[PDB]
Amino acid sequence: QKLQFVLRFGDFEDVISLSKLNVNGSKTTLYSFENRYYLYVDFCNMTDEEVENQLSILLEYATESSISIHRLEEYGKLIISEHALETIKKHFAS
């Protein structure tokens, strides 16, 4: 099963709320695409149980994007390059 997941965040304020929560060894990339911010968590490796696990918390603020990751990566826009969770807490707090 998937070990890198593509998540959609709603309005940016949802992302702030989120920002104050988790990364957990996930380089992660944050796209902007039709007003909503997608967050692509890319777990370097996790087991399926473990990835579904981690992915739970993220998906308290996100939903799991139906937009295949190369669709985001192409016609989207970078917000944070591959350390997005870590970075968004900076870049959305203090």
Partner: protein, 150 residues
């Protein structure tokens, strides 16, 4: 014409690049085809490159046409073939859910135009017209954006 993403417009103008560079005085569909694969990371570009048709493979056939060429390139404009292919991409983007039409649709548009210059280029370089459109199709659609849920 009149609406188009960069990627579409870009493959089309890249045809004009081929106009003088190959000397095809007015740029056929082959140059549009070349355009797709020569922008590299366009969904069309990528698609042809999947099937094995890199910029090289296309351009080799293309060079076997007018081949650099009438570099004067009298009326460095489109042809009725190429203008149709562009129009076809528009329909291939209506089809694929892109209002401002992208690269992909243009490769799709080639397929559509299966007696066209691109198409015959592709039928000389092997690659079946529907496998080529296939590759493009499978890199579009299946989305939900402007939203996160409902």
């Amino acid at each position: 014409f009149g609406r188009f993403t960069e990627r579409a417009q870009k493959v089309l103008a890249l045809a004009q690049e081929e106009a003088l560079r190959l000397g095809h005085n007015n740029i056929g569909t082959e140059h549009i085809l070349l355009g797709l694969v020569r922008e590299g990371e366009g969904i069309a570009a990528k698609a042809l490159q999947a099937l094995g048709l890199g910029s090289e493979k296309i351009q080799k056939e293309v060079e076997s046409l007018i081949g650099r060429g009438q570099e004067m390139s009298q009326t460095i404009h489109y042809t009725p073939r190429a203008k149709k292919v562009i129009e076809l991409s528009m329909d291939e983007a209506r089809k694929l859910g892109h209002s401002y039409v992208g690269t992909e649709h243009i490769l799709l548009g080639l397929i559509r135009e299966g007696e066209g210059v691109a198409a015959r280029v592709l039928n000389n370089l092997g690659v079946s017209l529907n496998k080529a459109r296939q590759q493009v199709l499978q890199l579009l659609g299946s989305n939900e954006t402007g939203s996160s849920a409902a």
